[PDB]
């Protein structure tokens, strides 16, 4: 006993010294314990088991144990992982499966107090501590009279609590035992830190993959809530890692129709009583999407599910819809409140073990759906990490609800635009009475309202009811529309279309042509100057240029057809305000079209008119010819913008100079025709000349037209002053009315003179136009100088 004093005896055999051998064997065993973690394919539980066996051997204790720490619903708890670990014990028998664990909340149990305090706790007598619990002792029939537990804390977080119980050869765990425990559990802490870091990396990788795939599927196509949610969930199937999960979508109709409210207010039907979302809507799951992953990988959709549906049999989805909480539940059927299915859920042997239900939340914090995730692939209950992943997924879906709403708004806007355009086309299109007012088939052919007459007969009868082209000076630059009514202008326009020999050549219908002419007239508004009279004047000027000006030799019949049509439709639906007011007033036209707002609007409207089969004047020509006509139409209408003409003046001048040096007309025709760009430039200049042709009219017509233009510009300036609070330019200012002559002189010297000078140089037959302009300028000078005399 105590007779011989303590000494570090040298064994000579099998050992140099007791302490030296102890240190050597301890170092070797610790090295092997560290190498355990490097053995890929194993688990940290095996290393912890080896460490606990060594600790039990060294401390002369019994039944070493480990309790892992979880966090559910925001509260921590512990669960036994390794129990009754003793020296020379099998790992498989010692490990506790997820279905046999005992869960302790932090507030009960010595394990709970150790985890909460994050410090070593050594209790010599369990009966003297209020934190001791008898749950495990009564469950397993084991008596404990000594405890020593230190938590495994890394990163200010507890992973496990490891204890030793009932020292066999003593009644107390001394301080040295506590120190040895602390160091060995530091090594176990290294192992558990490695494991926890790997688990964190896997969790974050799963979360990032979920976000990638949800973003890829959401931005793939703009669809509704159901299809988008189905795509996202079906894609992130693998990364959820759940045996089975579902999503239920609630109805979003926050208000009832007035005819469904009468029985409620009259008392015929009792008021609704039952679950309600925080917004106040009745909890009505209108669709359930079930994803089956345990076997056969089934996916099913239940529209208007019954209350007998296995997802809704328990009250958890309805509870989530009512409250909006995140519900984490372990051993759900054992719970009394929610009444889960204790037995098999369906015909196959599947039972509900753990449930995780989260709500999908709109921008307005409304509840759009409830996503319920059932038992995990492994037997372990849902941790805080699974809650993190599923919460991120549900937040992403609630955000993509914006894309769903935008798709719905897209559909509504498209439908409203289609309805408005159709109604506008119905209003604008010429009525059959208006067509009959021109194509008098009833009073001349003796036929019923229904048209079954031959096209040639229609051409022949219409050609006898149109104004004579030689009379009314339709071929002359002096043509004045003042003595003609608008119906006469329509008739003259149809006659102009007939005179170039394109109705018979391209087999355009007579009724279609008349309807198109009348619709084009009705498209022009009732503004002072940019009305149907201006459109017909431009069309007649283009016809004069093509026929009298001998420019038709540069263009084919189809091209001339396009020129006449675009000249007639060059100013369609003009509101009376130029591009500057469109930009300054932030009109929808300016927001839709960037450059040449009015020209692009006219082109779009005229192409819309040509799209309809009842107005398509180019109905019977080839596809390539139609594409050519559309391109010609675009060029002609866009060229009417005077900025483009100002930019291309020099190009046209170069073309004219090149053509002037040739002594043979055939050579000039060959030079122009072979290059489509030259034809397009000449066409743009022709359109500009047609638009400005009002200047070249005789003096009375020019004076009246200039007065009309001035009256339109003054109205625009007054409206700009009223609604834009800006001072108009002197040209558009009404108070500068007496300044009208001088300005016009400038307009002749700045814009119009170049076009007609270059056209007179290019073609001598267009000489009168320029001449007329000069005469008009002289007259305006006589009005400007008088103003200087009036001053």
């Amino acid at each position: 006993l105590g007779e011989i004093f303590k000494n570090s005896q040298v064994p000579v055999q099998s050992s140099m010294s007791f302490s030296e051998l102890t240190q050597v064997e301890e170092s070797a065993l610790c090295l092997e314990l560290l190498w355990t973690v490097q053995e890929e394919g194993g688990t940290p539980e095996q290393g912890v088991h080896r460490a606990l066996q060594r600790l039990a051997h060294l401390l002369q204790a019994d039944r070493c144990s480990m309790f892992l720490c979880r966090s559910r619903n925001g509260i921590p708890e512990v669960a036994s992982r390794l129990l009754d670990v003793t020296p020379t014990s099998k790992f498989e028998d010692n490990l506790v499966g997820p279905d046999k664990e005992v869960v302790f909340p932090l507030d009960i149990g010595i394990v709970g107090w150790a985890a909460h305090t994050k410090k070593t706790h050594n209790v010599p007598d369990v009966k003297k501590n209020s934190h001791f619990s008898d749950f495990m002792d009564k469950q397993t029939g084991y008596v404990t009279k000594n405890l020593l537990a230190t938590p495994i804390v890394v990163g200010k977080e507890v992973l496990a609590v490891i204890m030793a119980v009932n020292k066999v050869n003593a009644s107390e765990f001394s301080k040295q035992d506590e120190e040895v425990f602390s160091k060995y559990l530091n090594f176990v802490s290294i192992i558990l830190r490695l494991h926890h870091t790997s688990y964190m990396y896997n969790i974050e990788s799963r979360r990032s993959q979920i976000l990638m795939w949800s973003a890829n599927k959401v931005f793939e196509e703009l669809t509704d809530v159901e299809r988008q949610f189905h795509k996202a969930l079906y894609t992130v199937r693998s990364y959820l890692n759940c045996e089975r999960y579902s999503i239920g979508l609630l109805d979003m109709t926050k208000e009832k129709e007035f005819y469904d409210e009468w029985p409620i207010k009259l008392g015929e039907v009792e008021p609704y009583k039952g679950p309600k979302t925080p917004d106040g809507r009745e909890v009505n799951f209108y669709k359930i999407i079930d994803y089956i992953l345990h076997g056969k990988e089934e996916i099913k959709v239940i529209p208007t599910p019954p209350a007998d549906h296995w997802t809704l049999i328990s009250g958890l989805p309805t509870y989530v819809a009512e409250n909006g909480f995140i519900c984490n539940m372990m051993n759900a059927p054992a719970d009394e409140y929610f009444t889960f299915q204790k037995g098999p859920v369906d015909e196959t042997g599947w039972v509900i073990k753990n449930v995780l239900s989260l709500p999908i939340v709109n921008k307005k914090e409304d509840i759009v759906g409830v996503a319920t995730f059932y038992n995990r692939k492994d037997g372990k209950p849902f941790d805080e990490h699974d809650e993190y992943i599923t919460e991120t997924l549900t937040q992403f879906l609630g955000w993509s609800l914006l894309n769903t709403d935008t798709y719905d708004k897209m559909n509504k806007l498209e439908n409203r635009k289609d309805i408005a355009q159709e109604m506008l086309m119905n209003q604008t299109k010429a009525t059959p009475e208006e067509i009959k007012s021109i194509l008098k088939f009833q009073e001349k052919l003796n036929v019923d309202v229904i048209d079954d007459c031959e096209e040639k007969q229609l051409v022949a009868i219409l050609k006898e009811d149109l104004p004579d082209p030689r009379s009314a000076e339709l071929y002359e630059f002096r043509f004045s529309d003042f003595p003609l009514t608008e119906h006469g202008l329509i008739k003259c326009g149809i006659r102009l279309f007939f005179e170039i020999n394109v109705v018979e050549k391209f087999k355009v219908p007579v009724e279609v042509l008349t309807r198109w002419m009348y619709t084009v007239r009705k498209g022009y508004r009732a503004v002072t100057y940019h009305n149907w009279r201006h459109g017909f004047n431009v069309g007649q000027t283009m016809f004069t240029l093509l026929m009298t000006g001998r420019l038709k030799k540069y263009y084919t019949d189809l091209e001339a057809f396009a020129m006449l049509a675009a000249a007639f439709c060059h100013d369609i639906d003009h509101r009376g305000t130029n591009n500057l007011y469109q930009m300054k007033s932030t009109s929808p036209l300016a927001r839709l079209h960037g450059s040449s707002i009015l020209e692009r609007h006219h082109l779009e409207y005229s192409k819309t008119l040509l799209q309809d089969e009842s107005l398509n004047i180019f109905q019977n020509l080839n596809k390539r010819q139609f594409e050519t006509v559309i391109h010609l139409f675009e060029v002609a209408i866009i060229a009417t913008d005077l900025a483009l003409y100002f930019k291309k003046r020099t190009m046209f001048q170069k073309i004219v100079d090149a053509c002037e040096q040739m002594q043979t007309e055939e050579e000039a025709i060959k030079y122009v025709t072979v290059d489509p760009t030259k034809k397009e430039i000449i066409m743009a200049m022709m359109m500009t000349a047609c638009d400005l042709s009002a200047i070249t009219k005789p003096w009375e017509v020019q004076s009246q037209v200039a007065l009309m233009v001035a009256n339109e510009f003054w109205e625009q300036g007054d409206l700009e002053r009223t609604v834009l609070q800006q001072q108009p330019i002197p040209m558009m200012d009404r108070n500068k009315r007496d300044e009208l002559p001088k300005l016009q002189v400038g307009f002749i010297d700045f814009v119009c003179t170049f076009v007609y000078k270059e056209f007179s140089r290019f073609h001598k037959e267009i000489t009168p136009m320029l001449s007329g302009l000069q005469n008009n300028r002289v007259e305006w000078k006589s009005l400007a100088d008088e103003y200087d005399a009036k001053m």
Binding site: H230, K300, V301
Partner: protein, 46 residues
């Protein structure tokens, strides 16, 4: 010359016939007396 550079990766996330159950998901569809059920359809009331 320029150093060798990494090509863009698109196959991994390149990836509804593929997604089962989409046929009954595009549109969802939800009263009178016994005799009215046929007479209303006869007159185009509904």
């Amino acid at each position: 010359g320029p150093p060798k550079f990494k090509q863009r990766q698109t196959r991994q996330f390149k990836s509804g016939d593929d997604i089962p159950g989409m046929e009954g998901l595009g549109t969802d569809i939800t009263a009178f007396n016994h005799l009215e059920l046929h007479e209303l359809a006869q007159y185009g009331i509904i």
